[PDB]
Amino acid sequence: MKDFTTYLSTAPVVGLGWAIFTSGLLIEINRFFPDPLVFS
Amino acid sequence: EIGPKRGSLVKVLRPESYWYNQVGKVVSVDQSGIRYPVVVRFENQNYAGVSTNNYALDEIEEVK
Amino acid sequence: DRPLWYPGATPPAHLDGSMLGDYGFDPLRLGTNPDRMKWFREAELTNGRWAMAAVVGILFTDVFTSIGLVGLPKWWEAGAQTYPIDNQTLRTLAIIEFLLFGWVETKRLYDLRNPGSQGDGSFLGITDGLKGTENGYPGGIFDPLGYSKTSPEKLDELQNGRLAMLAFLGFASTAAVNGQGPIESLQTHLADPFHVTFATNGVSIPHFTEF
Amino acid sequence: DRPLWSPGSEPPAWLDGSLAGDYGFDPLHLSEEPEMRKWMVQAELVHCRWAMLGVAGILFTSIGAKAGGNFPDWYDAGKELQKNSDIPLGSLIFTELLLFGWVETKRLYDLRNPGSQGDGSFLGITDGLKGKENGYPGGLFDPMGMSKNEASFKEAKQKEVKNGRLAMLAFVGFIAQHHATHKSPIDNLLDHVADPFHVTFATNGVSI
Amino acid sequence: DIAGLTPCSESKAYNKLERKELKVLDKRLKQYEPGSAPYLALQATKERTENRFKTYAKQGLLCGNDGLPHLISDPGLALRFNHAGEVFIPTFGFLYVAGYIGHVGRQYIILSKEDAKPTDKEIILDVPLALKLAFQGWAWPLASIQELRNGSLLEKDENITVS
Amino acid sequence: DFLVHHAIALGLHTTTLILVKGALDARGSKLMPDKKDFGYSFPCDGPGRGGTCDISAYDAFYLAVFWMLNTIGWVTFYWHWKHLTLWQGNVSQFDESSTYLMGWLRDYLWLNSSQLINGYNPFGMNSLSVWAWTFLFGHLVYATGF
Amino acid sequence: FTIHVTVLILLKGVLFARSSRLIPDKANLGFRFPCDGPGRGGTCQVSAWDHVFLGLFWMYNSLSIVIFHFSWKMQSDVWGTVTDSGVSHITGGNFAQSANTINGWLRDFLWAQSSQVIQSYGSALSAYGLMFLGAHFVWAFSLMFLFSGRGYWQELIESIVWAHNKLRVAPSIQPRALSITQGRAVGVAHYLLGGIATTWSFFLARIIAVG
Numbered sequence A: 001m002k003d004f005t006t007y008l009s010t011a012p013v014v015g016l017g018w019a020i021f022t023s024g025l026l027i028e029i030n031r032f033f034p035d036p037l038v039f040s
Numbered sequence B: 001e002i003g004p005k006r007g008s009l010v011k012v013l014r015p016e017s018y019w020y021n022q023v024g025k026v027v028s029v030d031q032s033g034i035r036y037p038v039v040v041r042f043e044n045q046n047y048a049g050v051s052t053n054n055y056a057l058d059e060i061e062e063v064k
Numbered sequence C: 001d002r003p004l005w006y007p008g009a010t011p012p013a014h015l016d017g018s019m020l021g022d023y024g025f026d027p028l029r030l031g032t033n034p035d036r037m038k039w040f041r042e043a044e045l046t047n048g049r050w051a052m053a054a055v056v057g058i059l060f061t062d063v064f065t066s067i068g069l070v071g072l073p074k075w076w077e078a079g080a081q082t083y084p085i086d087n088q089t090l091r092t093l094a095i096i097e098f099l100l101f102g103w104v105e106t107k108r109l110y111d112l113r114n115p116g117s118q119g120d121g122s123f124l125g126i127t128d129g130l131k132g133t134e135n136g137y138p139g140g141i142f143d144p145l146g147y148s149k150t151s152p153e154k155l156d157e158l159q160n161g162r163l164a165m166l167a168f169l170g171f172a173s174t175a176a177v178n179g180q181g182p183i184e185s186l187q188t189h190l191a192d193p194f195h196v197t198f199a200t201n202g203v204s205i206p207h208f209t210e211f
Numbered sequence D: 001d002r003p004l005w006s007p008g009s010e011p012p013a014w015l016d017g018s019l020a021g022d023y024g025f026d027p028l029h030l031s032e033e034p035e036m037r038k039w040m041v042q043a044e045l046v047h048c049r050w051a052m053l054g055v056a057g058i059l060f061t062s063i064g065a066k067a068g069g070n071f072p073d074w075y076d077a078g079k080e081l082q083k084n085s086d087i088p089l090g091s092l093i094f095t096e097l098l099l100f101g102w103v104e105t106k107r108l109y110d111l112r113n114p115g116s117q118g119d120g121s122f123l124g125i126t127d128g129l130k131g132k133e134n135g136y137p138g139g140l141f142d143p144m145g146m147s148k149n150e151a152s153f154k155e156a157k158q159k160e161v162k163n164g165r166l167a168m169l170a171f172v173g174f175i176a177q178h179h180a181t182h183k184s185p186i187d188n189l190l191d192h193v194a195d196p197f198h199v200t201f202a203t204n205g206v207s208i
Numbered sequence E: 001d002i003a004g005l006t007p008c009s010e011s012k013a014y015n016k017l018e019r020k021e022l023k024v025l026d027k028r029l030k031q032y033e034p035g036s037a038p039y040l041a042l043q044a045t046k047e048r049t050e051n052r053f054k055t056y057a058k059q060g061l062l063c064g065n066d067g068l069p070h071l072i073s074d075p076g077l078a079l080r081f082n083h084a085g086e087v088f089i090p091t092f093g094f095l096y097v098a099g100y101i102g103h104v105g106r107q108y109i110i111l112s113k114e115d116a117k118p119t120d121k122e123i124i125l126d127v128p129l130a131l132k133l134a135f136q137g138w139a140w141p142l143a144s145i146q147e148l149r150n151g152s153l154l155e156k157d158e159n160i161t162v163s
Numbered sequence F: 001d002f003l004v005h006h007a008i009a010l011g012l013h014t015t016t017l018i019l020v021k022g023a024l025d026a027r028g029s030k031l032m033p034d035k036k037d038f039g040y041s042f043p044c045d046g047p048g049r050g051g052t053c054d055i056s057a058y059d060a061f062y063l064a065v066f067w068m069l070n071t072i073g074w075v076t077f078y079w080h081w082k083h084l085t086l087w088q089g090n091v092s093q094f095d096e097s098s099t100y101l102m103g104w105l106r107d108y109l110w111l112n113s114s115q116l117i118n119g120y121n122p123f124g125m126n127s128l129s130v131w132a133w134t135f136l137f138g139h140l141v142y143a144t145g146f
Numbered sequence G: 001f002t003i004h005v006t007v008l009i010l011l012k013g014v015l016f017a018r019s020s021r022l023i024p025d026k027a028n029l030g031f032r033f034p035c036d037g038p039g040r041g042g043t044c045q046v047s048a049w050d051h052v053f054l055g056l057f058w059m060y061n062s063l064s065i066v067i068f069h070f071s072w073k074m075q076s077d078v079w080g081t082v083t084d085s086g087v088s089h090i091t092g093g094n095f096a097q098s099a100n101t102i103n104g105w106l107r108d109f110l111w112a113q114s115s116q117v118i119q120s121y122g123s124a125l126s127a128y129g130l131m132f133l134g135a136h137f138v139w140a141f142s143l144m145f146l147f148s149g150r151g152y153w154q155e156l157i158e159s160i161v162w163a164h165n166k167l168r169v170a171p172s173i174q175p176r177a178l179s180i181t182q183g184r185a186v187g188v189a190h191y192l193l194g195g196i197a198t199t200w201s202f203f204l205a206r207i208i209a210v211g
Ligand code: CHL
Pocket: C098, C099, C100, C101, C102, C103, C104, C105, C106, C107, C110, C122, C123
């Protein structure tokens, strides 16, 4: 398990988790709050 | 003793070198009158892949 | 060191040393370098001291307002009530506020840089009174009540000052989604606590679940 | 030296047998490290203790509903009780989230640092509010002296876990045989006792 | 107004563009039945489109002769004519986020280089350390000016040159 | 017109980068501390040191010409279309369609290449046949350089 | 013509892989190597790997016309709607007259059949209009890698490393420009992807919107 967690700490695996976060965050912020252009 | 101490870090002053104004460990020093006795080892590789090079007394100076 | 903001196991690194209102609260480690920790300390005071004297104008007056003794306006619309008055003082107030503070504050700015640095003949004749005991705690400004040896009445100055800094942040936020004053917001939480809150009525969260 | 989940299988090296409810069951090699093992035993117990506390609430109401009392199904109970309540939703949530953040956070820092909450900061309480073990506190959460004996405390830990594993399996049952029958658990029981051979999962019209 | 631009509320082409984009959906909506899912999907798109147009008008935007909204960049005209949310304010919303990424990556680089084998720490990250710095960077402008005024931000002629 | 004047700025600042670099790093680089001994134009220093293809200052000028032509192309495409809409009377063509790149491909290139391409049709030939022939002649010479 | 040539590039690489007159010892250098050196007037792209890298460009030029042959022939002479009086083909049977000229391939195939792709904005085929453009970007983007060389880029990174070094934010993994063979591979990849994806958009949008 120590080696499994180490594999998960590699660059591409951590980058995958980053991408799902930043992408899912932006999408759900466009799912709700649709079409922002001017900021109030 | 002719030159810097074993295991001592020194800064390079060859303008040609990849390691210029950079620091490296002194691996050894020869006291037989050679022109470039001081052997130095760096962690970072050069463009070819070599991490050591023999420098001179005047070309090296104290760290930082 | 006074007690810890977490009761349990949050070791601070540089706050074990003496300082006022030390509760070991610096997660972001913005007070590592001592030179700028010395600067942020004075910032907590000028914000603390200023915020408290400000909160009274919102608090001491609105209590008298809700009871009905005086008919003063609320802080969220006190500014638009002054200038329409016939005898008014239209906005040369922003600049005079800066010309007057600019004289005092730079005298305070040059004190932190050079402590006790007020020359002999610089001011008319009161050059001696302007010297301070410490940074942030000068001598000749207070007339009584600063000769004790256990000087930490200062802890009261901070715990009261940090508290007021929360007040104005709550006044400004309450007065942006509730639409009413601070005391009017209090009379409602007492009359109907569960209905008037930041969750359901005060739109601080998008809660629309009608079922 | 002890029973196991599958007789004859070599137990893992890290499961020595001291923990409560240890039968050598960890094929995924989880809790192989000490720190994760220290975290999971506390996760198992809260998932257990909440199951017992909750499942008993379902049986009490579903029995009172079958007897005649005015109790609804455990499902669609939060929907019909909020329609006619003086407490709006949102004021009830963040009364729960805010109050649990106190407890759930104090329990965390006893985990990361045992004996840390017994400093006396919280209302001058020192002897209590310091952990006897990882997931087993005492002093204040054990008013009756039912833990000051290692002989009777070690087997009680085995009963807390055995009646707990069973309990949070039952909650998975309620979810499953509700979606199939859309009836209460007790009603499904009396049907099986009435005609055991005919009314089973095979004849519910689902799962086939 | 400014620059010979009309507000989007008063413009005719702006409303012309609304009547056009809705007419496409109404024609597309005729094919399907009322209670079907394609009908619900198009009605939602109709609801979003009606909301997009009214919100841009309510926000004091400026529409040109073509009928599309235009943005203004000078903070002077933006603040004078109440168009600050367009460009001027998002400028500070980005730079807070961008400097967050620099202050974080700069700290992970410095701290891993203080230990043995920093090359392994780049390809195999120390996730506990990375999350620690990522939640400590909320106040990166304070640390920058702290590090600039101190002088430990920049290196001083200990860098490689070429001649 | 706003987006193009900024896209033109991309050309001048990056074209200058390629040429400025080939000048200042003409005397020497860390990869080649003595370029000055070889000359302005030499092929390379070999596959050693990871590869040394296109280091000389001649090879910087060589790469900048591709950007010179790209930059002047944007500058010149912007002149022609903005003036055609003026001469045709329909200025709204440029204002609405020049904001997205399919407008350049649809309304400027694809559209105005109709009379040209029909210079020599299978039915007959107009006076623009010499230009359509040259129009391919350049589409060919360009490819032979590849 | 395109086939006998594509064989020449690959078959030459095979037979001359082990040895040649210019380089009697290639086998010791290996399968993929960029060059022996500038000597002999130049020995760039002499390996067998670099023959494959060239053959892909000719495979592309070959099948791209096998595909255009299938589209224009079948649209003009085969496909179409049958009416009471014969068949009405899609392009009116213009393969016989226009195809003999190269301008015909430019006029009647490219300029004409690109109307469905270009006018796809605002419809369900809008994705093909974007892929049609993005495929051109990735194609031209490849030209940086094929035309240029590793030398210019490794020097540029040094001036960039200075700034990253000046701010004490530099990678312990030193940045190095791509190898020679990699720049060639990266080129043909982004090249073929952009060349092939353009047809994939030009065709499906043309044919789904029939005619
Ligand atoms: C030649 C240029 C000169 C400049 C640029 C400054 C700049 C400064 N001095 Mg001097 N000083 C200068 C000359 C001199 N200073 C002094 C003596 C001092 C002292 C003793 C002090 C300063 C301070 C200051 C600061 C004042 C900031 C401020 O409040 O400004 C904003 C602008 C103003 C204050 C001007 C306002 C206009 C005004 C005077 C109008 C007067 C009419 C009345 C208002 C009418 C009454 C109406 C009633 C109803 C209100 C600033 C750093 C202070 C400081 O920070 O020290 C560290 C300070 O304590 N200066 C002398 C005599 C030796 C000078 C001789 O040339």
